[PDB]
Design a protein around this ligand. Sequence first.
Ligand SMILES: C[C@H]1O[C@H](O[C@H]2[C@H](O)[C@@H](O)[C@@H](O[C@H]3[C@H](O)[C@@H](O)[C@@H](O)O[C@@H]3CO)O[C@@H]2CO)[C@H](O)[C@@H](O)[C@@H]1N[C@H]1C=C(CO)[C@@H](O)[C@H](O)[C@H]1O
Ligand SMILES: C[C@H]1O[C@H](O[C@H]2[C@H](O)[C@@H](O)[C@@H](O[C@H]3[C@H](O)[C@@H](O)[C@@H](O)O[C@@H]3CO)O[C@@H]2CO)[C@H](O)[C@@H](O)[C@@H]1N[C@H]1C=C(CO)[C@@H](O)[C@H](O)[C@H]1O
Ligand SMILES: Nc1ncnc2c1ncn2[C@@H]1O[C@H](COP(=O)(O)OP(=O)(O)NP(=O)(O)O)[C@@H](O)[C@H]1O
Ligand SMILES: Nc1ncnc2c1ncn2[C@@H]1O[C@H](COP(=O)(O)OP(=O)(O)NP(=O)(O)O)[C@@H](O)[C@H]1O
Ligand SMILES: [Mn+2]
Ligand SMILES: [Mn+2]
Lengths: 299, 306
Amino acid sequence: MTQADVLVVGGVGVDHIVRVKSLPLPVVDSMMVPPIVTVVGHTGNGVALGVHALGRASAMADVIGDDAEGRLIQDAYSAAGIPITFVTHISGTRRSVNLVTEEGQRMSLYDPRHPFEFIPDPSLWREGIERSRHVHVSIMNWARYALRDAVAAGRSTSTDLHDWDGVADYHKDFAYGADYVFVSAAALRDESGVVADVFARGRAQFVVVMAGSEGARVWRRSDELPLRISPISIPGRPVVDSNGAGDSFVAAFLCHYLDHGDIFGAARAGAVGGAWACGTLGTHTSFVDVETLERLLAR
Amino acid sequence: LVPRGSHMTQADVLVVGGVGVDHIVRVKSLPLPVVDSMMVPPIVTVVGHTGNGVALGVHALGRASAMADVIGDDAEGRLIQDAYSAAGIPITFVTHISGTRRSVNLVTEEGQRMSLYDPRHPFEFIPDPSLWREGIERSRHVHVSIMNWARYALRDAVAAGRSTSTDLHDWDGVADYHKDFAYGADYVFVSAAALRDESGVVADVFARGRAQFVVVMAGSEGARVWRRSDELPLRISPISIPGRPVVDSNGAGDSFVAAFLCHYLDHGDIFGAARAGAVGGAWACGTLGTHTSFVDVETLERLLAR
Ligand SMILES: C[C@H]1O[C@H](O[C@H]2[C@H](O)[C@@H](O)[C@@H](O[C@H]3[C@H](O)[C@@H](O)[C@@H](O)O[C@@H]3CO)O[C@@H]2CO)[C@H](O)[C@@H](O)[C@@H]1N[C@H]1C=C(CO)[C@@H](O)[C@H](O)[C@H]1O
Ligand SMILES: C[C@H]1O[C@H](O[C@H]2[C@H](O)[C@@H](O)[C@@H](O[C@H]3[C@H](O)[C@@H](O)[C@@H](O)O[C@@H]3CO)O[C@@H]2CO)[C@H](O)[C@@H](O)[C@@H]1N[C@H]1C=C(CO)[C@@H](O)[C@H](O)[C@H]1O
Ligand SMILES: Nc1ncnc2c1ncn2[C@@H]1O[C@H](COP(=O)(O)OP(=O)(O)NP(=O)(O)O)[C@@H](O)[C@H]1O
Ligand SMILES: Nc1ncnc2c1ncn2[C@@H]1O[C@H](COP(=O)(O)OP(=O)(O)NP(=O)(O)O)[C@@H](O)[C@H]1O
Ligand SMILES: [Mn+2]
Ligand SMILES: [Mn+2]
C-alpha cells in the first residue's frame, strides 16, 4: 500500500530440502536421509526477504496457488512486515525439491507449475511499479512485461538470469531489458561473448556474474575485463547451503547501490550476505542485517 | 504425549506405526543426470509409508482397519489426519516435536523408484503403550510396522493372544534391529532384496522365533512362502492383471500384505491368501505413484477364480 524501495516481481514458491551424502545419487531403491525441511523460497522470495532484512522496504508481486503452500507463503509474508500482492492460479503454487550435499553441491528439481502461456492481470505489477523506486524482475515467463512496464515507467530495473545458457531465447528479454543484470557463471559457455552481446543488444548498464565459491565477476562497457570480487569468509560462519545465496547477493547489492551509486561497493556488499546465506541451511532461512553488514564491510 | 484421535469400534486389522507423507517427483530417467537445475512435472504431496499402505489396502477390501502411530504437530501431520477421516479409518496417535515422517520419491516414466526416507523420530523414543493397547483390545489382528518403538506393541499384542504380522522390508538377515519383529510375529513378511542366505534366515526364524510362516516377496519374480513342514519354499506366481499393465511397482509390498491378511483372516488358507496378495501387489503395480488405488473384493475374487 505504501512506498517500497525494491519491488520484486514473481519468484515465490516452496522448497523441499533433502540433505544427501553426495551427488550423483547412489544406486538404490531406498536411502535414508536426515530431516527433509520445507521452507518458503525461490529466487524472488530470496531477494525480497534480503531487502527487508536490510532495513529497506520490499514488496512482492507473484502468482501463487490456492494450495496449502500458497497460504504458507501468504502469512509467512505477514509474519514479516512484507507486502505481498498475488493472484491465485488453479495449477497452484510453484514449488521445488532441492538436493544438497554436505559439502555444498546443489541440484534443483523445479516445478514452474503455471501454464507457460499464462499472463496475470498487469495490474498485478503495475500498481507496485507506481509505488516503487526499483524493480527486480524474476524470470517467470510473464514477468517480462512487468520489466517492459517498469522500464517504460522510468524505474531502475534488475533481473537474475541464474544458470542460463547464454544462448537460449527465453532469458533474452530480461538480459537485454534490465538496468542491472545478474547471472550465474554455471552454464555460461563464452562469458566474455555473452556479456559483450548483452551490452551490445541490451540496456544492461553493467553485468554481475556470480560464480559460487570463486566469488563474482563485474562487467562494464568501459572495461574490456571483469572486475573480480573475491568470496568472503565470515569469521565464525562456515558454508552449509549455497541455496538462496544468489538472491541474497542481489538483495545486498541492490540495497547498497540504491543508496550509494557505487557499483563495486555494492558488489563487495553483495559478496557479504551472499556469504551470510551460506552459513545457514535451507534456501532463504537467514539474511544479513544493516549492523552486521557494516561491521563485515569494514572487513 | 498422551494418545488421542478417533477409535471406538471393533477392527479387523490394527496397523501399528508406519504413516507419513510422500513427495513424488517424476524424473526423465534414473541414474540422475548431472545438472544444476532441471524442471519436472507437478510434485504432488500424498499420505503414504508402509503402515498407511496396509491400513488402506485392508479398508479397500471391505474390512475394518485402524491406525496407531507417531505423527507430528505438522501440516503434513494434519494432512494425514483428515486424509484418514476422509476415508472411514480410525487413527490414534501421539505427537513428537521432531514431526511427521516424510519421504521424497523419485519416479521414472518407466517405473523405476528411488526413495529418500526421513524417519525423523528419535530412535530411542517410546510412546506410552496406551497408544496401541486400546487398539489391540478392539482388534482381531495386529499388523506391526518396523518402527523401533513398535517393538513393544508387538510384544503386547502377542500377550493379548491376537494373531500378529509384520513387514521387515529390506533385511540382510543379520541386523539385530529387525530380529525382535522377525522372531515375535505370527505372520512374517520380508523382501527378498537384501536376503543373502534366504534359506538359512528362514530356518533360523522358525527355530528361534514364533514365525508360523514366512512370506518372502520377490518383486517381478513373484513370492515365496515358507513353512516349518516343507523344506522348500512354495512359489507363488506373479499375477498379470487383464486390462492393467505394470507401470509402477511402488506400494506393491504393502498391498500384497493387506490382501493376504484379509484373505487369511477369513479363510485360513495360506496358499489361497498368498495368491490374493500376489493380486493385491500386482494391482499396486498397475497404479501410478501419485494415485492411491487398491483392489476391492470383487476384482480380487474374480481374478482369484482365474
Ligand atoms: C528461477 C528459476 O530460473 C530458472 O528456471 C527457468 C528456466 O531455466 C527457463 O527455461 C524457463 O522454464 C520454462 C521452460 O522454457 C519450459 O519448460 C516451459 O514449459 O516453461 C518453463 C517454466 O517457465 O523459466 C524458468 C523459470 O520460470 C532456473 O532453471 C531455476 O533453477 C530457477 N529456480 C531456482 C531458484 C531458487 C532460488 O533462487 C531455488 O529456491 C529454486 O528451488 C530453484 O528451482
Ligand atoms: C519402513 C522402512 O523400514 C526400513 O527402515 C528401517 C531400517 O532398515 C532399520 O535399520 C531402522 O533404521 C534405523 C537405524 O537402524 C538407526 O541406526 C537410525 O539410523 O535410525 C533408523 C530409523 O529408525 O529402522 C527403519 C524403520 O524405522 C527400510 O529400510 C525402509 O526402506 C522402509 N521404508 C520404505 C517403506 C515405504 C512404503 O512401503 C516408503 O514410504 C518408504 O519411503 C520406504 O523407504
Ligand atoms: N562457498 C562460498 N564462500 C563464499 N561466498 C560464497 C560461496 N558460495 C557462494 N558465495 C557467494 O554467494 C554468491 C552466490 O553464489 P552462486 O551459487 O554462484 O549463486 P547461485 O548459484 O545463482 N544461487 P541461486 O541464485 O539460487 O541460483 C556468490 O556470487 C558469492 O558472492
Ligand atoms: N513388476 C511386477 N510385476 C508383477 N507383479 C509384481 C511386480 N513387482 C512386484 N509384484 C508383486 O507384488 C509383490 C510385492 O513385491 P515387492 O516389490 O518385493 O514388494 P516391496 O519390495 O515391499 N515394494 P513396497 O510395496 O514398496 O514395500 C510381489 O511379491 C509380486 O507378487
Ligand atoms: Mn541464481
Ligand atoms: Mn517392502
